[PDB]
Symmetry: C3
Amino acid sequence: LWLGLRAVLVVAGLAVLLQLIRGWLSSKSYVFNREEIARLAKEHSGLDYEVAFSKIIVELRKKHPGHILQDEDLQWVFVNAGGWMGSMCLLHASLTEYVLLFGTAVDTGGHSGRYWAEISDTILSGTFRQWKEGTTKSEIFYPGDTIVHEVGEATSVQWSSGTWMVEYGRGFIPSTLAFALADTIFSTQDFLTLFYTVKVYSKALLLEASTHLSQ
Amino acid sequence: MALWLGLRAVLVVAGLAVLLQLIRGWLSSKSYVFNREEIARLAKEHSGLDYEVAFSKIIVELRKKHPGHILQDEDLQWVFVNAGGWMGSMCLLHASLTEYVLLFGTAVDTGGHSGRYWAEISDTILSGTFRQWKEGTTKSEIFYPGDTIVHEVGEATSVQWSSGTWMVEYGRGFIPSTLAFALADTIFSTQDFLTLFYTVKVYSKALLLEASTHLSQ
Amino acid sequence: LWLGLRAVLVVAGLAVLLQLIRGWLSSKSYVFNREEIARLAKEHSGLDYEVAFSKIIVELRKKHPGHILQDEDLQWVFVNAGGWMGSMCLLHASLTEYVLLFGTAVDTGGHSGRYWAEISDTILSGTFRQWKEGTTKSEIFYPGDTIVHEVGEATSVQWSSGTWMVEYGRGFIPSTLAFALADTIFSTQDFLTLFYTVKVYSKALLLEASTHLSQ
Ligand SMILES: O=C(OCCN1CCOCC1)C1(c2ccccc2)CCCCC1
Ligand SMILES: O=C(OCCN1CCOCC1)C1(c2ccccc2)CCCCC1
Ligand SMILES: O=C(OCCN1CCOCC1)C1(c2ccccc2)CCCCC1
Ligand SMILES: CCCCCCCCO[C@@H]1O[C@H](CO)[C@@H](O)[C@H](O)[C@H]1O
Ligand SMILES: [Au+]
Ligand SMILES: [Au+]
Ligand SMILES: [Au+]
Ligand SMILES: [Au+]
Ligand SMILES: [Au+]
Ligand SMILES: [Au+]
């Protein structure tokens, strides 16, 4: 039964880690909230998305100091996943939450991805077409609306050539990195972008670790 | 004995050569259930109604003229399909080792590679638009409800669909050869393994139903 | 430290092979130049791109005999990379240069790819949307314009259903085939197109080598 030792060790490891992480998510104090980020974006969902980005980043650093990356650690990184292409401006990220500014300047679309995280996007500009699984009709969302991509749900997304939004996710963030980097490995082969994504995600983790040490 | 390093290589070449003649001889001596004109005619008769109403009447007509070969309503579900760079959904009605009939379409604007496989495929558009770009050309053609696109064996084209395109599709050949292309984006791009499970689920039910019909006959 | 011998040989092998190629590219006599191809393509940037294809091939074979493939060795080969799909007509190709006619008859777009080659495209018809890295707005280019994709640059490309262009690239051409065939391996699995791409690239390499033997 020695050959089965490896198979038992992974099943026991996955079952223990599944209860360890799920019990952590149900007992962890969270920094941001899905309604908090959506409300913040709706305050400026009339202005220019560049003007909205500035006022949103300023308001986030006031209400949650020590949790948003500095302007020195901010950069627009391309994101290739599920067949669509966009760019992100990661403001905050931990092992359980993340807040970023996502959007695209071209017409893209594809698979939303199925992972262990609840994702909410509040559109600031452009349009957002969503196709839920098992249906034959899609819905188009406009600036001001908030789309909630629930955990375990898989939909089809599509954006116009000027769509920008504010996004908040909660769950187990590392579970999404397999889907977020799939097209970067097998399609674009833009390993420099792969480096940028790990770079800014590590800075957000080190910043979050630095805040817990001071408290 | 130089045949030791070549033992795996010869067995695969011998295995492929034996399997190639056994499958191609089967396709030339097997009685087929459906017909390429039969599915296309049935879909074109309902290409003026709403595609949801057309789906219902086509499934009824298929179960009337071909009982025991179309899945029951309990075993039907819309499964996402990501392949060649496009994304849609299918409703597998019938499928065997040599034929398959399903309802495919998309609610978004997608497009990509049609895939090159060992199966002749015909699609009759019920709604939306269908742009096809054949290999070796510099211009594309747009197909409208009522038209039928024939994707011959070994042909590779570029496909593109509008945000409301739905169609009835029939394929004949060696169906397992197409599953390698149908699941490529599901493995390397979307990683939606639950959809991968659904595809294997609905394709197995169609095989078990078709096998269940052969046992009673 | 015995197992680190392979790792040192790889670091020394990659660093030395980088110096030899980069120093070769910076001191090598080239056949074509981007301004030569750009002027030739801009003169024929009209509506009838098929007539433009013929007139460009004739002019290229006059001023550069023995460097452009004959009509017998020409075929339109599909190109799937970065999420977009088009077709190419390889006219000239070496280890450092290539001249081809690229375009698409459908609406595609995706990652431009980051590789070791400077690429310039002069639009003959259609439209070309380029989304530079780190920005939030994209630009649309029209027939007559020339887009220069420099080495190490990564952008988002998008084309309309009638875009055709003349392209010239210079750098390390074998480094670009890894990106050009990525989607063909992991998405389309069109092994026949993979054969066509290697076939026409081999004929173009053998043609360029055949001219060096006669000279
Ligand atoms: O930044 C992202 O992409 C937002 C776009 N959204 C739009 C629709 O819902 C899913 C993704 C993701 C990320 C990237 C990098 C770090 C952490 C997260 C979010 C997880 C899924 C994709 C990659
Ligand atoms: O369900 C499909 O996709 C329909 C779309 N049509 C549209 C364009 O031409 C090819 C397929 C396919 C399938 C997948 C799995 C089982 C049975 C069939 C058909 C074969 C080629 C792709 C995958
Ligand atoms: O032929 C091509 O594709 C042109 C399309 N362009 C359009 C935008 O910029 C990058 C590619 C490429 C090639 C393929 C085969 C041989 C030599 C070159 C050029 C390098 C990058 C992709 C593949
Ligand atoms: C590649 C083909 C694109 C079609 C050209 C017309 C539309 C492109 O124009 C786009 O319109 C949007 C507002 O409407 C803007 O947000 C985009 O920045 C602009 O590029
Ligand atoms: Au930024
Ligand atoms: Au920003
Ligand atoms: Au269904
Ligand atoms: Au159905
Ligand atoms: Au050609
Ligand atoms: Au040509």
